[PDB]
Amino acid sequence: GPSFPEPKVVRSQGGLLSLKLSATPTPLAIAGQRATLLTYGGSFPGPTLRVRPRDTVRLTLENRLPEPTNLHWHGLPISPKVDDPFLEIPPGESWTYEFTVPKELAGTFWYHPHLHGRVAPQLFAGLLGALVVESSLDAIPELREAEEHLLVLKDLALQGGRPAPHTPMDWMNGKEGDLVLVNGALRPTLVAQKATLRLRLLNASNARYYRLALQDHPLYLIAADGGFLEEPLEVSELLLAPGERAEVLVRLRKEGRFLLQALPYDRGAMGMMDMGGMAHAMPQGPSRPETLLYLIAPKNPKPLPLPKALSPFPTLPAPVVTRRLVLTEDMMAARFFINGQVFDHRRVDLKGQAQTVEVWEVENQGDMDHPFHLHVHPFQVLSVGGRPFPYRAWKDVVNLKAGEVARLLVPLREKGRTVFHCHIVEHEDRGMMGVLEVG
Amino acid sequence: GPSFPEPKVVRSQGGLLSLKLSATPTPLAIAGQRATLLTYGGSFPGPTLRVRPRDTVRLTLENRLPEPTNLHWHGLPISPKVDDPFLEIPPGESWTYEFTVPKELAGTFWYHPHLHGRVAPQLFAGLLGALVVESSLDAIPELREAEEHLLVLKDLALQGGRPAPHTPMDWMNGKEGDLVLVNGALRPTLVAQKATLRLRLLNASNARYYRLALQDHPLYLIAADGGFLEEPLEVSELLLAPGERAEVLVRLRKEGRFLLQALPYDRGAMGMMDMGGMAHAMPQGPSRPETLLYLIAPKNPKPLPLPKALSPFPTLPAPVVTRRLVLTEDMMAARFFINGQVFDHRRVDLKGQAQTVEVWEVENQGDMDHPFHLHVHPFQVLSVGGRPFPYRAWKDVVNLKAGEVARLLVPLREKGRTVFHCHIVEHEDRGMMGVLEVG
Ligand SMILES: [Cu+2]
Ligand SMILES: [Cu+2]
Ligand SMILES: [Cu+2]
Ligand SMILES: [Cu+2]
Ligand SMILES: [Cu+2]
Ligand SMILES: [Cu+2]
Ligand SMILES: [Cu+2]
Ligand SMILES: [Cu+2]
Numbered sequence: 001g002p003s004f005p006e007p008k009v010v011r012s013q014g015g016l017l018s019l020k021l022s023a024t025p026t027p028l029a030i031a032g033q034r035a036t037l038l039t040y041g042g043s044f045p046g047p048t049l050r051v052r053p054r055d056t057v058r059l060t061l062e063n064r065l066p067e068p069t070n071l072h073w074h075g076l077p078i079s080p081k082v083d084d085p086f087l088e089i090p091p092g093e094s095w096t097y098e099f100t101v102p103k104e105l106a107g108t109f110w111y112h113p114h115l116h117g118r119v120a121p122q123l124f125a126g127l128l129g130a131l132v133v134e135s136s137l138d139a140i141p142e143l144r145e146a147e148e149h150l151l152v153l154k155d156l157a158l159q160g161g162r163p164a165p166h167t168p169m170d171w172m173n174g175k176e177g178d179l180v181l182v183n184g185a186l187r188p189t190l191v192a193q194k195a196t197l198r199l200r201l202l203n204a205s206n207a208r209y210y211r212l213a214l215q216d217h218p219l220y221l222i223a224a225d226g227g228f229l230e231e232p233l234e235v236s237e238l239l240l241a242p243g244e245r246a247e248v249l250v251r252l253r254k255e256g257r258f259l260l261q262a263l264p265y266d267r268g269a270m271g272m273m274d275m276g277g278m279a280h281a282m283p284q285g286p287s288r289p290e291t292l293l294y295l296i297a298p299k300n301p302k303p304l305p306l307p308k309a310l311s312p313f314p315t316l317p318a319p320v321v322t323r324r325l326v327l328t329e330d331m332m333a334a335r336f337f338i339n340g341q342v343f344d345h346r347r348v349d350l351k352g353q354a355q356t357v358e359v360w361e362v363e364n365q366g367d368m369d370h371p372f373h374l375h376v377h378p379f380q381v382l383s384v385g386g387r388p389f390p391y392r393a394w395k396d397v398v399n400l401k402a403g404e405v406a407r408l409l410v411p412l413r414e415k416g417r418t419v420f421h422c423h424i425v426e427h428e429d430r431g432m433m434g435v436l437e438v439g
Numbered sequence: 440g441p442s443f444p445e446p447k448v449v450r451s452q453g454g455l456l457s458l459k460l461s462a463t464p465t466p467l468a469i470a471g472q473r474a475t476l477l478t479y480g481g482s483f484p485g486p487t488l489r490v491r492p493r494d495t496v497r498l499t500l501e502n503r504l505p506e507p508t509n510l511h512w513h514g515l516p517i518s519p520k521v522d523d524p525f526l527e528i529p530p531g532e533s534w535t536y537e538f539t540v541p542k543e544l545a546g547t548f549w550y551h552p553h554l555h556g557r558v559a560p561q562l563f564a565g566l567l568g569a570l571v572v573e574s575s576l577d578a579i580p581e582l583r584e585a586e587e588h589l590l591v592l593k594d595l596a597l598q599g600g601r602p603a604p605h606t607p608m609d610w611m612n613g614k615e616g617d618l619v620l621v622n623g624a625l626r627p628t629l630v631a632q633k634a635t636l637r638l639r640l641l642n643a644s645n646a647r648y649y650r651l652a653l654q655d656h657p658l659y660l661i662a663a664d665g666g667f668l669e670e671p672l673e674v675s676e677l678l679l680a681p682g683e684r685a686e687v688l689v690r691l692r693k694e695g696r697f698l699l700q701a702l703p704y705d706r707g708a709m710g711m712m713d714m715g716g717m718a719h720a721m722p723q724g725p726s727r728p729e730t731l732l733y734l735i736a737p738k739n740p741k742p743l744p745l746p747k748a749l750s751p752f753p754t755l756p757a758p759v760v761t762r763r764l765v766l767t768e769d770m771m772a773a774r775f776f777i778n779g780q781v782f783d784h785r786r787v788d789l790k791g792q793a794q795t796v797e798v799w800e801v802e803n804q805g806d807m808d809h810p811f812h813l814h815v816h817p818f819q820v821l822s823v824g825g826r827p828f829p830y831r832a833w834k835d836v837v838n839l840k841a842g843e844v845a846r847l848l849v850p851l852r853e854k855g856r857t858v859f860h861c862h863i864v865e866h867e868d869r870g871m872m873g874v875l876e877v878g
Binding site for chain 1 (some may be wrong): 759760761
């Protein structure tokens, strides 16, 4: 096969992507060992769905797991009557998701389970895949002539040939694994054929962060979670929290081998110690550095010029309300809260008006990083930690370090009941989620 | 008695105003005829209550009417558990209102009935009185040395020695009377003893407007409904809609007689005509000019200088929500609506947070003027009809002409359930009222 493993692609045909996918325990070869994972479509990651605006998607999910499950179309601004976070598909049963891809949309999105209380073990076990919305912008020469790849960043731990079970500490921190994989492969080699690469990046891990840096190179950010930036942004490194996506251009500077690494990053995970009167919580500190892949540049690389512009960001109406959502923790109980409450599916927490804009101020009063996700309604991050964001683009996850306030501009789109929650999925399962009703 | 009739004053004593008032049908002499009115304290208007900030008011209202009644402490930012618009005092029963006068408060306020469906006939019949909150500002020489008077502007119509009954057309327009009175007197004479007058003005009419102008003189506005301006504002005339108050300084310029008039004003009241295929509604047009009082200046008047400053207006926090309230009419049905609905005491229309500020945009989509009143929470009028207000002061009624939008800054104070409504009281009785809950 190709030196660089990527999930198989399923494309819409004549404007329709019609597909049956099973969620099933699947024996496979992974990082060199045989293991049984939970997969969609018999692979890890699941197949990449590639569509265009205005396509119809008709996806029939057959539940072949011993527990109920469902799908969240992460990042898609569609109706919460389709992307229904409350729906349960019992074992053995099927459900068909049908929706039209919005006209003004582009980027890398993904699908995974969202049945409250069961997300973390199901996601950790291998249930996820990417969805790419192709754009007319992809035809500009600066992108068309680039070599494009998807990088699904997901870690795993195995025990007795199966995903390792969650411990109590995993429920508190969010579970990380020792196998730090790209597209389900252990440190693959990407032998580039072109001097410019276009990489779509997805953090599909439960809890692991990726402080991305390519040796000797900057990255040029061209898209965030839910759409293009207005113009490329040069960065030295790029942190992707759980649930986030980004697209970058890489302009290979000279021949050679360059490591793409996940540099050390401290997200505030905790351990326990006993020093003589102790048993108390103590910071785990920064993650150990990981090599994600080996990037081999071609002979005499001459990268394309960068695009001068990408997509203009919409001019939003003035907002009609300001919300404050405060995140807190009870680490030893592994309980997590928004405005002092845990999720209750029967309780509506916020009620807003469709087609108005709101300002959401999300404050992390905990000590751990928490990546805040809102379904259905992509947002523009104005500032985090009091620092203005250096670009305009649609996002649907925003990372908050301890103490930080994020200020978001949130246009409300589809009517109905949906959710917002931490995307360290253990924290969501353990209560850090609330309900928004849009009418 | 004094050439100029004013209601008797009841003052707090040692920080307490403790008073029993009866609401009772009362034979009296009015504008030269004997009539029976509905009064508080056996007089029309009722007694003026004069208090200071931090005083305790203990007012026991005995209902001696053949129908239920209650009190609204119009303009007082006190708790809606005291100023309770839903409370009913049955015939023969009593209720004690007890509250403390807020520390940061000054101006002319008033009391009258607010039992939904019965306000217009009860107010028209004579049930109202003023409440004055004295201020340390009253001690500055420019005010202390002025000659002070209260002018209660209220009209009346009599039929068979009693207030004229409401007709169907009265319910549509709001009832006006032919006797246009000041402090219950017909065109009294005010023989001034000082060159500067301080006049507290109250429009306690059901529906009549007073486009105020003093012959040959400007007026200097020093207070609006609920507090002082920041500095005096010179005006050529001053429109007071139902429920509004103002305080003005008058600087008498030369000896002589000067008429205070209510100049012609068209508030959009309607009549009916039949011209040959007709019976349809037709504008009544402007009111006929009325003389309110005769003002006699003293010998060689030398008015005091104006105060350079009054009270600085508070710096309000940034608002957290914007509301839109649209007023409409069904004239032939005499039904009146806010956002397409009529009042329902069981229905909460707006829910806000105490100690936050809201922006209320009130839009008149009717053809009549509607004076919009909010209980409990005084507001700052930012603009009306797209025109910025020329001063900062607390108001609690704002007049909207046909088509106009008022933009209000509304700090929410006391928690609880209260109301907002048109202060053409017939319109309130006929449905133009909604419910705000503050928590
Ligand atoms: Cu997700
Ligand atoms: Cu989501
Ligand atoms: Cu979290
Ligand atoms: Cu979610
Ligand atoms: Cu009133
Ligand atoms: Cu009121
Ligand atoms: Cu009205
Ligand atoms: Cu009222």
